[PDB]
């Protein structure tokens, strides 16, 4: 388990990457 | 809970993203 | 130890960086 | 505490940001 803030950052970073890729596709 | 260094990195990454977005808005 | 989602994000971020560098080299 | 791989990713990400900023300064 992780600090909730670290969980939140991790979700944000993954979503960031997915959106960036979709934007380029 | 997380290593303090991981907490720090997570805060930095979120702030990074917020600043980048504000810069573009 | 970390939340599995944080582990996954960390692996993704490292791979992201490695691919970006290889792309530029 | 965190998974060592998460610690490593966090260090890499911070160093990444510091290098990127120094490169731009
Ligand atoms: C298109 C807009 C996209 C915006 C993405 C950037 C969003 C930035 C906002 C981040 C909010 C983080 C929410 C964080 C929510 C969890 C905070 C918490 O309760 O921490 C407690 C622990 O420390 C206890 O150990
Ligand atoms: C260019 C923008 C790219 C980012 C787009 C993101 C859009 C949606 C924003 C995502 C923020 C989701 C943060 C969600 C973070 C939830 C943290 C959590 O797990 O709650 C606490 C538990 O750990 C138990 O205490
Ligand atoms: C506009 C400038 C923006 C600069 C952003 C980049 C900043 C880079 C500096 C990072 C400082 C990280 C602070 C880290 C502070 C926590 C360190 C710690 O005590 O770790 C102990 C644990 O390992 C025990 O398990
Ligand atoms: C382009 C620059 C984008 C980044 C801008 C960032 C500006 C502000 C810098 C943020 C650094 C905040 C790091 C703060 C990290 C605090 C770590 C902590 O939580 O203390 C230890 C506890 O976990 C308990 O031991
Ligand atoms: C070239 C394409 C590259 C795509 C990279 C982006 C991929 C985005 C997808 C992310 C999938 C994340 C998998 C996450 C797998 C672990 C989820 C989990 O079981 O969490 C449980 C814990 O919360 C219990 O505490
Ligand atoms: C521009 C694309 C850059 C990203 C390319 C990534 C391509 C490959 C995708 C990587 C996703 C790997 C996620 C793998 C995450 C595994 C999480 C895990 O460790 O399982 C659970 C355990 O913690 C125990 O419960
Ligand atoms: C200028 C080049 C910059 C390259 C930056 C990218 C480097 C990519 C390489 C990453 C190596 C990660 C090292 C990771 C070292 C810790 C691995 C580990 O022992 O994990 C065990 C835990 O899972 C047990 O729970
Ligand atoms: C554009 C390149 C930007 C990245 C430049 C990075 C250059 C230096 C590379 C950094 C990799 C450092 C990874 C160091 C990761 C150490 C993980 C660790 O803490 O060991 C295990 C403990 O947690 C206890 O088991
Ligand atoms: Ca932990
Ligand atoms: Cl963690």
SS (H, E, C) chain D: CCCHHHHHHHHHHHHHHHHHHHHHC
Q: Give chain A's largest Cα–Cα span.
A: 34
Q: Taking the CA of residue B24 as centre, how many other CA atoms within 13 Å lie in the half-sphere pointing to its CB?
A: 6
Nearest to A5 by CA among D17, D25, C6: C6
Rounded distance, CA C4 to CA C2, Å?
6
Can you give the resolution of this entry in Å?
1.1
Which of chain C's residues have a Cβ under 8 Å away from the Cβ of A5? none
For residues A8 and C9, give the distance between their C-alpha atoms in angstroms, rounded to a whole number. 11
> Cα separation of A3 and D2, whole Å?
9
* Cβ–Cβ under 8 Å, residues B3 and D1: yes
Contacts of B2 in chain A (CB under 8 A): 2-3, 6
Method: X-ray
- Give which of A9, B5, B13, C3 is closest to D8, Cα–Cα: B5
């Amino acid at each position: 388990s992780s600090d909730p803030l670290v969980v939140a950052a991790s979700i944000i970073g993954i979503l960031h990457l997915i959106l960036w890729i979709l934007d380029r596709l």
